[PDB]
Design a binder for these strands. Sequence first.
DNA 1: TCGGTAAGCAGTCCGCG
DNA 2: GCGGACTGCTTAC
Length: 901
Amino acid sequence: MKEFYLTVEQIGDSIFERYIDSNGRERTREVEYKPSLFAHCPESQATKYFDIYGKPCTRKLFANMRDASQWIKRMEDIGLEALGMDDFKLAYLSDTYNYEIKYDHTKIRVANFDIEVTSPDGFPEPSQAKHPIDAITHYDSIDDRFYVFDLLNSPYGNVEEWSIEIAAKLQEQGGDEVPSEIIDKIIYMPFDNEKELLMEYLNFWQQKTPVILTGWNVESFAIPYVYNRIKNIFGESTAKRLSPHRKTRVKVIENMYGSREIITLFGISVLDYIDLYKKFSFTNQPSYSLDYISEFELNVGKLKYDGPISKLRESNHQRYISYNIIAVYRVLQIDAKRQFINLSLDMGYYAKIQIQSVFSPIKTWDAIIFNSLKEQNKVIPQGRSHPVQPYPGAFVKEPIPNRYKYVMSFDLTSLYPSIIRQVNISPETIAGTFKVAPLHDYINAVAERPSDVYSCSPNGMMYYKDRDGVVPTEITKVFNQRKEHKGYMLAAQRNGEIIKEALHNPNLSVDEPLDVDYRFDFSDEIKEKIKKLSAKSLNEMLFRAQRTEVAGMTAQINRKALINGLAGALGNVWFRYYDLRNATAITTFGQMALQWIERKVNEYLNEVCGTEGEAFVLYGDTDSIYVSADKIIDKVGESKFRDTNHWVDFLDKFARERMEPAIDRGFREMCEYMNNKQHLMFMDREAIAGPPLGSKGIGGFWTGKKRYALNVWDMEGTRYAEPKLKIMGLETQKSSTPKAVQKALKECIRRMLQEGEESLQEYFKEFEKEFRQLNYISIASVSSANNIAKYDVGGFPGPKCPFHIRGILTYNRAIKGNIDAPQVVEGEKVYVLPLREGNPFGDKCIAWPSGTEITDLIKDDVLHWMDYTVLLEKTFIKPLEGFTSAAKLDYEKKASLFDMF
DNA sequence: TCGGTAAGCAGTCCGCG
DNA sequence: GCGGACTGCTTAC
Ligand SMILES: Cc1cn([C@H]2C[C@H](O)[C@@H](COP(=O)(O)OP(=O)(O)OP(=O)(O)O)O2)c(=O)[nH]c1=O
Ligand SMILES: [Ca+2]
Ligand SMILES: [Ca+2]
Ligand SMILES: [Ca+2]
Ligand SMILES: [Ca+2]
């Protein structure tokens, strides 16, 4: 097999590399790598190395990496550019793996672990590590085993061994329900003392050294705790055995308001799963406890126990250990679904970076561009210091707030990357500038044509047309990968809808789910077989189709995020290729493209309808337009359609056969006007929306910019079994909105769009009457909580104290003195409830850590004093009033002359 | 929360005769 | 009471 790296580090003058050799074995080597850097040289000097602008360079080979670093410093002292890859390990990988890396995940040791630490006096601080580690569960992907290290004797209690037999039993048998599929994979090791436990764990780690190390909060808790505890008991040298090269560093992570410490383990790649999830999931959750995320992702129930976690080991050691094991498994289950480790490996090996560097789009693109340029013996520029400067972004149209009955939307494919490719925007393709007219003049095609030679953006920049820049070349490669995965995602989505339709008529039989590839549209033969399947088999197939869609979504949306990240990196001062001329060339071209095509679409539809000056485009944001289709439907007449699907078909065909060719002609003209390199503005129909045929539903409404709701029948070629609400920006979509209120507001919207005013009034009346019975957690608001200290004046709110922070201060006074009460953590999320006048907490609200029940001490008083009237007005009535006023509807029935009968 | 801009709403403070 | 200046937080792209 072809060799591939696992990890790489620089330690002084050596590169330490772990890798898989040509025979598939894991090896380690230390290499005295001699790096090269570059200086500009005279034109009359033979070289094969050129910078990105075509100026000749001489290569300087150093005796060691320290010599190279010192040379960079002296070049700064002189005032001359020091060119080349200054991150020597990236250069090492580029020289050692000079081909497209083909990796074999089965050879990569991925470890998932979790620790338990009993603590009487609050949260066990990892930097102190003053309490025994009393359990470790460590799953190894190569062994496919859960290694369980269990402390039986502690200063906080002596316990009996954990029983695998009880662990396996149902909770209704008094068991812990450890999933049967992992029971045979557990290797249980009990210990008489903590010193022996940790010594054995280190010997185990030496034998089975993680390449990828993951788990939940491992970077901020488990790793520093284990390192510091071993340090405290045995000394520094022993703790450093967690690194295969015996090297560690305390790293200070700084933010806006403070800092924290993590431990860097040289020769390991730590990918904390909470951080993978936050980067790659595109969710914003009210809590990031593993129980909360597990319930959201997997629909598994919360891990139930009695009393505080600090007393769990002593009271129920059996459950304590089972729950440690289950926590490790839940992370593996989330990854089986979301496939974030797979994604990280794919992108890391593609770029040729340390795998943990996938968190940084700047580092990722630096490496991709470096490797690409090196292939042509070109030499990268030195990174420079720049002051942070604001720059302009997208255009968003101000919509007229209203109901909109029939709507079709259109959207540009991969806009910012397509602009980069069309215009040919790159550091080395800058050709010069032209004299800019107001943007309006380009939009309306009255400005002078910018150039007869170069490719232009309306910010004034011109670009070469003779050859593609490196940024367009490399962005195209990742875009093509994205396109492939998006295809699989959409096919799985369409396949899912076929199964949903079939589920209306399930067959009374015993059979099996079909063995199919859900990434490809079902054949006619498969469709025929599906129509004969049982509900059991169909539901299994739906679950599998949906898992295939999730896998495709992970792969496509994150490749989209990477290519959009390159457009953004051009506007980040830490990027080697930072240039506001290029960042603004992208965003300004986008503003023009949207407004240009709004004009062309209005012109086309006014012509087909025989009117003048009427606005068909009701809204647009960045690269999308929303078109009123009422007049199109009315030209046919509603009574002429057989059912909803009939007019949906008609609009689908109108969009494809009439509107898209008109849009294409419009953009081709724009490409010629700007003299661009290649026409790549591809705007296809996205949504077809409207009320059910014959209903009193309103179809859709807008309240303002980035705030609308549509009843959608077809999305990007997926024809839904049931209409789907597309809601953007409204409170239903915000993590700050109470869970039960999101649900109620969504039902109000559904009723408005699908059924009409009377239906809305009926539901509102019921919600208002019953909502006080809702569980307190479900009606609590949520907020991140920063700067608690800034606003705390002797335990009371200082000037301008935010509402949620006020709630935290209230909580802190109520729990004062208690060492075991859950503390609110700076920067994390809290639940918030309003309090009625004259409550014993002495303020108008209270807040506590999100994802948790409020502590028993004050729970009774919180429930008794919760202000339901304020809660309802603020979270439900006010947003609903906004929706209904915009849609010209009433949520309460107004008096009529009929009330007289 | 270590890792592009536009823009909405909640809440504080305070003016507005 | 509602709007502007401002902070804080959270979305849509
Ligand atoms: C979603 C998103 C968009 N944008 C910018 C760049 C996008 O090209 C532009 C439009 O966003 P989108 O229409 O969401 O995305 P897209 O056009 O890149 O891709 P698709 O093919 O799925 O339509 O907004 C960002 O800069 N960052 C982001 O996270
Ligand atoms: Ca735990
Ligand atoms: Ca788009
Ligand atoms: Ca059937
Ligand atoms: Ca869009």
